[PDB]
TrEMBL record:
Organism of derivation: Acinetobacter baumannii
One record GO biological process: Gram-negative-bacterium-type cell outer membrane assembly
Encoding gene, per UniProt annotation: yaeT
Protein name as it appears in the record: Outer membrane protein assembly factor BamA
The family this protein is said to belong to: Belongs to the BamA family.
Full protein segment contained here: 21 to 348 of 834
Keyword list, A-Z: Cell outer membrane, Membrane, Repeat, Signal, Transmembrane, Transmembrane beta strand
GO cellular component: Bam protein complex
Predominant place of localization: membrane
Localization of this protein: Cell outer membrane; Membrane
Function, in words: Part of the outer membrane protein assembly complex, which is involved in assembly and insertion of beta-barrel proteins into the outer membrane.
SUBUNIT field: Part of the Bam complex.
Length: 328
């Protein structure tokens, strides 16, 4: 292979003479793999190409390239909180500015940096999306849309008496990532009351689903710091011992339920207690009665709890109420 000519296809802004100068290979030189790779390498060094491939078309050396676009303008939509100048100055350090070569692989990185700047301004739910729109003469416009989220809060959740669940699990029970926390000013506000009640209910549900029927919250405390940044939460609980399912008894007015099956599919005798399983049985019974025309059916649950054996026996007294065609 003696190169009698070299052609390079894919240039828009870059001139052919420029690339020929950049190319270590010249017309008339004998080429090879260590040539061509090196040539591609130096072209890849340029920073102006995204992809380069080579071919040998009948003693002609052919490069097929993709030129990277040039940033024409940066569009900001949703930056009411941060002035465009400051995050533009942040953008200049990574090389994203008007008149710069744009690398697509760094696109998400740009987002990250904006998110990583919108944390030093005290915002946690930062989400920035960047759209590239093509512009004539191989230019590109970066339309960046911002989503501030809610003001960030740092939590100091502490639970006294937790010897079953790992601290991450209780932290999740508190539902840290929620919009309600940002709207709380003081600890006796309605929002704090509702959020604390929901979190304590979630903690209680976690304990009741694991078999801790005697679980009882002892005390709770929420503390906010003026300009609401740090929230301290104290929850002292009484775990109790773990309990297991005893014998099931569907007394009262089961009638429209043969037995078992669904109850046994949910749970069996001797396994770990769970409030969710009992509620599932209750809602199955209520659904069956509702489909049969009993729109006011109820299930009353009476437990016999033996703490020494740790065994709970459930009695389901179901009250169907009046069938609809009886009243109408």
């Amino acid at each position: 292979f003696v190169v009698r000519d070299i052609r390079v296809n894919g240039l828009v802004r870059l001139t052919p003479a420029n690339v020929y100068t950049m190319l270590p290979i010249n017309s008339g030189d004998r080429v090879n793999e260590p040539m061509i790779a090196e040539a591609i390498r130096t072209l890849y060094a340029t920073g102006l190409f995204d992809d380069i491939k080579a071919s040998k078309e009948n003693d002609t050396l052919v490069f097929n390239v993709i030129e990277r676009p040039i940033i024409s303008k940066l569009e900001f939509k949703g930056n009411k909180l941060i002035p465009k100048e400051a995050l533009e100055q942040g953008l200049k350090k990574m090389g994203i500015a008007e008149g710069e070569v744009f690398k697509k692989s760094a696109l998400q990185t740009i987002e990250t940096e904006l998110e990583q700047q919108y944390t030093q301004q005290g915002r946690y739910d930062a989400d920035v999306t960047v759209d590239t729109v093509a512009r004539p003469n191989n230019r590109v416009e970066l339309k960046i849309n911002f989503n501030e989220g809610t003001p960030a809060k740092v939590f100091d959740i502490n639970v006294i008496g937790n010897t079953v669940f790992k601290d991450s699990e209780i932290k999740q029970a508190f539902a840290v990532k929620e919009s309600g926390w940002a709207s709380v000013v003081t600890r006796n506000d309605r929002y704090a009351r509702e959020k604390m009640a929901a979190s304590l209910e979630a903690l209680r549900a976690m304990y009741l689903n694991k078999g801790y029927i005697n679980f009882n919250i002892n005390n709770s405390q929420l503390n906010i710091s003026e300009d609401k940044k740090h929230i301290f939460i104290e929850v002292a609980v009484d775990e109790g011992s773990q309990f297991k399912f005893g014998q099931t008894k569907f007394l009262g007015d089961a009638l429209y339920k043969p037995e078992e099956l669904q109850a046994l599919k949910i749970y069996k005798d001797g396994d770990t207690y769970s409030q969710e399983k009992v509620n599932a049985v209750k809602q199955l019974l209520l659904r069956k009665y509702g489909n049969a025309g009993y729109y006011f059916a109820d299930v009353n649950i009476v437990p016999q709890i033996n703490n020494e054996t740790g065994v709970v026996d459930l009695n389901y007294y179901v009250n169907p109420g009046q069938q609809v065609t009886v009243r109408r």
